[PDB]
């Protein structure tokens, strides 16, 4: 949708905060939030596009100023409730229990070699999103194309700063999982993927750098031909 997370081109967000050196994880809870990504993925909470859609439904002021890994926690809860795997009222009661008893132990549990196996395989083997499709690519390098003006409320990768803009196809990458179906629970429905070059003057008008362009990735339905 048209949410606050679609920040490209937004002004007034402030100076970049860049401490001269920071750790990978700033607190123990960040390590836990990070590891929940492979865990909830394996358990069927969501795929990677659905993961993004969960973050996109946050309270915008909370999104803008909360720690990054807190966004991950919000998407786990979103999809935990959506799929009936997390009972919200039990989660709220346990939150209060851990507020009052922060050093109380975690539940007893057995370790599972299969989860270490999964972590190792996912990390070194990856989770590739490329797919083969029966249709040939509609477009090719050098084609001049126009980005769709559609404004779906579900998940998509259609930044507002590129909608309706004209650019040139730079490369075809093959077909990939399509966010507008995947992120909305509608399947992989893979589509060919292209990089399209938009000049800064096309994007920003006169305020655009005369010697800069933005290269943006477009799935095939996002673009229609202007000139071969």
């Amino acid at each position: 949708m048209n949410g606050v997370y679609d920040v490209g081109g937004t002004d007034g967000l402030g100076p970049i905060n860049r401490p001269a050196d920071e750790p990978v994880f700033r607190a123990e809870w960040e390590k836990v939030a990070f590891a929940m990504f492979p865990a909830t993925f394996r358990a069927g909470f969501m795929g990677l596009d659905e993961f993004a859609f969960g973050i996109e439904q946050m309270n915008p002021a909370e999104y803008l100023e909360s720690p990054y890994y807190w966004h991950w926690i919000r998407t786990y809860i979103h999809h935990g409730v959506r799929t009936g795997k997390i009972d919200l009222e039990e989660l709220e009661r346990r939150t209060q229990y851990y507020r009052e008893n922060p050093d109380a132990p975690l539940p007893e549990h057995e370790q599972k070699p299969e989860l270490i196996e999964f972590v190792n395989q996912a990390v070194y083997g990856g989770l590739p999103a490329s797919r083969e499709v029966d249709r040939p690519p509609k477009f090719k390098e050098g084609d001049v194309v126009r980005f769709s003006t559609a404004s779906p409320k579900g998940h998509a990768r259609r930044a507002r700063y590129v909608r309706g803009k004209t650019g040139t196809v730079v490369k075809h990458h093959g077909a990939y999982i399509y966010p507008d179906t995947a992120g909305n629970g509608l399947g992989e429905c893979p589509e060919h993927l292209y990089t399209v070059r938009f000049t800064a003057q096309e994007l920003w008008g006169p305020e655009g750098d005369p010697n800069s362009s933005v290269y943006y990735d477009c799935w095939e339905p996002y673009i229609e031909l202007v000139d071969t």
């Binding site: 390590k31 836990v32 865990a39 358990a43 926690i73 039990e90 990390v123 989770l127 010697n211």
Partner: protein, 203 residues
């Protein structure tokens, strides 16, 4: 920037910690999360995977013109030659800085980043201040924030990584490094130089 509405950092951290522990307890009881799984993920991205892997790729391209050709032709397969690849870098395209072109990478909608070559992204890359502005005023952002002056006649290409394709900058080899070994050259390659927010280290 101050927000008169916002709690203190200590109070926010206290609340998040309780919320995370409660959720952790529930996923543990479901059998889908364990303490060893958490420790394994943290170990990999704290001590194993990081920007030193990307540096090895950069220095090989700087000293091996045929490898550089393969790297720009297919970044995923070229990095596989060094045993580098995997999660969140299954599809990688490298772009070469030249005297005529400077490259900078961002995900305005997200936080996508090439984990197998750089490790996890620094917090500023994922935050709204860098993401919002780099697509709109890259030349001014590079100068004000990173002290990096790109002359106005030189083209800046901003790659907004809106897909699973990961873009990685191949920085230009610094002058005065004639005949250096790969271990010497790697000392000049930084995470920032492979994002495009800084050049490779001088001298």
């Amino acid at each position: 920037t101050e927000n008169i509405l916002r709690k203190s950092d200590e109070e926010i951290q206290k609340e998040i910690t309780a919320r995370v522990k409660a959720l952790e307890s529930m996923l543990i009881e479901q059998g889908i999360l364990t303490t060893s799984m958490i420790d394994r993920m943290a170990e990999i991205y704290e001590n194993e995977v990081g920007p030193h892997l990307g540096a090895k790729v950069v220095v090989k391209a700087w000293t091996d013109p045929e490898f550089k050709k393969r790297l720009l032709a297919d970044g995923t397969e070229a990095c596989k030659e060094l045993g580098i690849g995997g999660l969140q870098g299954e599809d990688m395209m490298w772009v070469e800085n030249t005297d005529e072109v400077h490259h900078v990478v961002v995900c305005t909608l997200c936080s996508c980043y090439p984990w197998p070559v750089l490790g996890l992204p620094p917090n500023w890359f994922k935050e709204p201040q860098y993401r919002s502005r780099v697509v709109r005023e890259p030349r001014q952002l590079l100068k004000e924030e990173f002290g990096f002056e790109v002359p106005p006649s030189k083209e800046i290409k901003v790659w907004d990584s809106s897909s699973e394709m990961r873009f990685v900058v191949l920085p230009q080899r610094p002058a005065g490094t004639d005949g250096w070994s790969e271990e010497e050259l790697a000392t000049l390659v930084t995470r920032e130089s492979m994002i495009g927010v800084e050049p490779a280290k001088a001298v």
